[PDB]
Coordinates of C-alpha atoms in Angstrom, one line a residue:
Chain A
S110 CA 16.0 -19.7 -20.4
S111 CA 17.1 -18.0 -17.2
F112 CA 15.2 -17.3 -14.0
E113 CA 17.3 -15.4 -11.3
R114 CA 15.4 -14.3 -8.2
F115 CA 17.4 -11.5 -6.7
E116 CA 16.9 -8.9 -3.8
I117 CA 16.0 -5.7 -5.5
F118 CA 15.4 -3.9 -2.3
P119 CA 16.7 -5.4 1.0
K120 CA 14.3 -5.6 3.8
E121 CA 16.6 -4.8 6.7
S122 CA 18.1 -2.0 4.7
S123 CA 16.4 0.2 1.9
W124 CA 13.6 1.3 4.2
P125 CA 15.0 3.2 7.2
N126 CA 12.0 5.4 7.9
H127 CA 9.2 2.9 7.5
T128 CA 7.8 -0.1 9.2
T129 CA 8.3 -3.2 7.0
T130 CA 6.5 -5.8 9.3
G131 CA 3.1 -5.7 7.7
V132 CA 1.3 -9.1 7.7
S133 CA -2.3 -10.1 7.0
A134 CA -4.5 -12.8 8.3
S135 CA -5.7 -13.3 4.8
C136 CA -2.1 -14.5 3.9
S137 CA -1.7 -16.8 7.1
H138 CA 1.1 -19.3 6.9
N139 CA 1.0 -22.3 9.4
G140 CA -1.5 -20.5 11.6
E141 CA 0.5 -17.3 12.0
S142 CA -0.2 -14.3 9.7
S143 CA 2.3 -13.6 7.0
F144 CA 2.7 -11.8 3.7
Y145 CA 4.1 -12.2 0.2
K146 CA 7.8 -13.4 0.0
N147 CA 8.5 -11.0 -3.0
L148 CA 6.6 -7.9 -1.8
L149 CA 7.1 -5.7 1.3
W150 CA 4.3 -3.9 3.0
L151 CA 5.4 -0.4 4.1
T152 CA 3.5 1.4 6.8
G153 CA 4.4 4.3 9.0
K154 CA 7.1 4.6 11.8
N155 CA 7.3 7.1 14.7
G156 CA 3.8 8.4 13.6
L157 CA 4.6 9.6 10.0
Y158 CA 4.9 8.3 6.5
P159 CA 7.9 10.0 4.9
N160 CA 8.3 10.6 1.2
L161 CA 9.8 7.7 -0.7
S162 CA 11.9 8.1 -3.7
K163 CA 13.9 5.0 -4.6
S164 CA 15.5 4.0 -8.0
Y165 CA 17.0 0.9 -9.4
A166 CA 19.2 0.8 -12.6
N167 CA 19.3 -2.5 -14.4
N168 CA 22.8 -3.9 -14.7
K169 CA 22.2 -7.6 -15.4
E170 CA 22.3 -7.6 -19.3
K171 CA 18.8 -9.2 -18.8
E172 CA 15.3 -7.8 -18.6
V173 CA 14.0 -7.7 -15.0
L174 CA 10.5 -8.4 -14.0
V175 CA 9.6 -5.9 -11.3
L176 CA 6.3 -6.5 -9.4
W177 CA 4.8 -3.9 -7.1
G178 CA 1.4 -3.2 -5.5
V179 CA -1.0 -0.4 -4.5
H180 CA -3.0 -0.7 -1.3
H181 CA -6.7 0.5 -1.3
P182 CA -7.9 0.7 2.3
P183 CA -11.5 -0.2 2.9
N184 CA -12.4 3.1 4.9
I185 CA -10.8 6.5 5.5
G186 CA -10.0 5.5 9.1
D187 CA -7.6 2.7 8.1
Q188 CA -6.0 5.0 5.5
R189 CA -5.2 7.5 8.3
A190 CA -4.2 4.7 10.7
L191 CA -1.6 3.2 8.3
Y192 CA -0.3 6.0 6.1
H193 CA -1.2 9.1 8.1
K194 CA -2.6 11.0 4.9
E195 CA -6.2 11.0 3.5
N196 CA -4.9 11.1 0.0
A197 CA -1.7 9.5 -1.5
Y198 CA 0.1 9.0 -4.7
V199 CA 2.4 6.3 -6.1
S200 CA 4.4 7.3 -9.1
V201 CA 6.3 4.5 -10.9
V202 CA 8.3 5.8 -13.8
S203 CA 10.9 4.3 -16.2
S204 CA 12.1 4.8 -19.7
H205 CA 9.1 3.1 -21.4
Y206 CA 6.6 3.0 -18.5
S207 CA 4.9 5.7 -16.4
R208 CA 1.9 5.4 -14.1
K209 CA 0.4 7.4 -11.3
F210 CA -1.7 5.5 -8.9
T211 CA -4.3 7.1 -6.5
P212 CA -5.8 5.2 -3.6
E213 CA -9.5 4.3 -4.1
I214 CA -11.2 4.0 -0.7
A215 CA -14.3 1.9 -0.9
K216 CA -16.0 -0.8 1.2
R217 CA -15.7 -3.7 -1.3
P218 CA -17.6 -7.1 -0.6
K219 CA -15.4 -9.1 2.0
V220 CA -13.1 -11.5 0.1
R221 CA -10.3 -13.4 1.8
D222 CA -11.5 -11.9 5.2
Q223 CA -10.7 -8.4 3.8
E224 CA -12.7 -5.5 2.3
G225 CA -9.6 -3.5 1.3
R226 CA -8.0 -4.5 -2.1
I227 CA -4.3 -4.5 -3.3
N228 CA -3.8 -4.0 -7.0
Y229 CA -0.7 -5.7 -8.4
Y230 CA 1.4 -4.2 -11.2
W231 CA 4.4 -5.5 -13.1
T232 CA 6.8 -4.3 -15.7
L233 CA 10.0 -5.4 -17.6
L234 CA 13.1 -3.3 -17.2
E235 CA 15.3 -3.4 -20.3
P236 CA 19.1 -4.0 -19.8
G237 CA 20.4 -0.5 -19.2
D238 CA 17.3 1.2 -17.7
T239 CA 16.1 2.4 -14.4
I240 CA 12.8 2.3 -12.5
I241 CA 11.9 5.0 -9.9
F242 CA 9.4 4.5 -7.2
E243 CA 8.0 7.6 -5.5
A244 CA 5.3 7.3 -2.9
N245 CA 3.8 9.1 0.1
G246 CA 1.6 6.2 0.9
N247 CA -0.2 3.0 -0.2
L248 CA 2.9 1.3 -1.6
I249 CA 3.6 -2.5 -1.5
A250 CA 7.2 -2.2 -2.5
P251 CA 9.1 -4.8 -4.5
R252 CA 11.6 -7.0 -2.5
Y253 CA 12.6 -9.6 -4.9
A254 CA 12.7 -9.2 -8.8
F255 CA 13.4 -11.8 -11.5
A256 CA 16.0 -11.5 -14.2
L257 CA 14.2 -13.1 -17.2
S258 CA 16.1 -14.5 -20.3
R259 CA 13.3 -15.4 -22.8
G260 CA 13.0 -18.4 -25.0
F261 CA 10.7 -20.2 -27.5
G262 CA 7.0 -19.5 -27.2
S263 CA 5.2 -22.0 -25.0
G264 CA 2.1 -22.1 -22.8
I265 CA 0.4 -23.3 -19.6
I266 CA -1.1 -26.8 -19.4
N267 CA -4.2 -27.2 -17.1
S268 CA -4.1 -30.8 -16.1
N269 CA -4.1 -33.2 -13.2
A270 CA -1.7 -35.9 -14.3
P271 CA 1.4 -37.6 -12.8
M272 CA 4.9 -36.2 -13.7
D273 CA 7.6 -38.5 -15.1
Chain B
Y165 CA -7.9 23.8 -35.3
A166 CA -10.8 22.6 -37.3
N167 CA -10.3 20.1 -40.2
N168 CA -11.3 21.6 -43.6
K169 CA -9.2 19.5 -45.9
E170 CA -11.7 16.5 -46.4
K171 CA -8.8 14.2 -45.6
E172 CA -7.7 12.8 -42.2
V173 CA -5.1 15.0 -40.6
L174 CA -2.1 13.5 -38.6
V175 CA -1.5 15.9 -35.6
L176 CA 1.7 15.3 -33.6
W177 CA 2.6 17.0 -30.3
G178 CA 4.8 16.5 -27.2
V179 CA 4.9 16.9 -23.5
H180 CA 8.1 17.8 -21.6
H181 CA 9.3 16.3 -18.4
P182 CA 12.1 18.3 -16.9
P183 CA 14.7 16.5 -14.8
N184 CA 14.4 18.6 -11.7
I185 CA 12.0 21.1 -10.1
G186 CA 14.5 23.9 -10.8
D187 CA 14.2 23.4 -14.6
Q188 CA 10.4 23.2 -14.4
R189 CA 10.2 26.7 -12.8
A190 CA 13.0 28.2 -14.9
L191 CA 11.2 27.3 -18.2
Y192 CA 7.6 27.0 -17.3
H193 CA 7.3 29.1 -14.0
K194 CA 4.7 26.6 -12.5
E195 CA 5.5 23.7 -10.2
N196 CA 2.5 21.7 -11.5
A197 CA 1.3 22.0 -15.1
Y198 CA -1.4 20.3 -17.3
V199 CA -1.7 19.6 -21.0
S200 CA -5.2 18.7 -22.2
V201 CA -5.8 17.6 -25.8
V202 CA -9.4 17.2 -26.8
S203 CA -10.9 15.9 -30.0
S204 CA -14.3 14.4 -30.9
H205 CA -12.8 10.9 -30.5
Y206 CA -9.7 11.7 -28.4
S207 CA -9.3 13.2 -25.0
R208 CA -6.2 13.2 -22.8
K209 CA -4.8 15.1 -19.8
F210 CA -1.1 14.9 -19.3
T211 CA 0.8 15.9 -16.2
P212 CA 4.5 16.5 -16.3
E213 CA 6.6 14.0 -14.3
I214 CA 9.7 15.2 -12.7
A215 CA 12.5 12.5 -12.3
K216 CA 16.2 12.1 -12.6
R217 CA 16.4 9.8 -15.6
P218 CA 19.6 8.5 -17.0

């Protein structure tokens, strides 16, 4: 019934100790490399990846769909190159959700030109609840969220037909 | 505890998550704790998560 894309974490603000200019050739837009419009790739600035602890409290009388990611580098060298720490943790906590994520370095079969994988996670913040992101590495932070008013049960139609 | 009542037993427990590291130490005297619950068909290992919840 409602779909409001809103900036949960501004790119120019909200990350003053990290590089937010991560792009990948697997997500190339019009030749040049780009990245997701709703996610932000945080890497290290001034040779360090500082501890991140950022919280958002829901204030929109609507459940908010928050999407984040966890990066799994292909080898240990890339892990040290981007996040400057052989092991990392991503704690995403809320009132009714709690998950710890640990990077899993492995050389996976090359898909979309890459061997490393990014696992995508989502949750629904209830109206009057907060989500806390803590991370010392491997965090694909949310940038745009979605306030979602729900409606009648429906589905997805898989078809190739004109629209009138 | 070993079941000797010939009936299924409902066992309830809980794990605490203090708001700040100060409380963790004050009450539990350890920065990082572990809670393992093991049964023949259940096995879980909980870690306290410290956060400033509302």
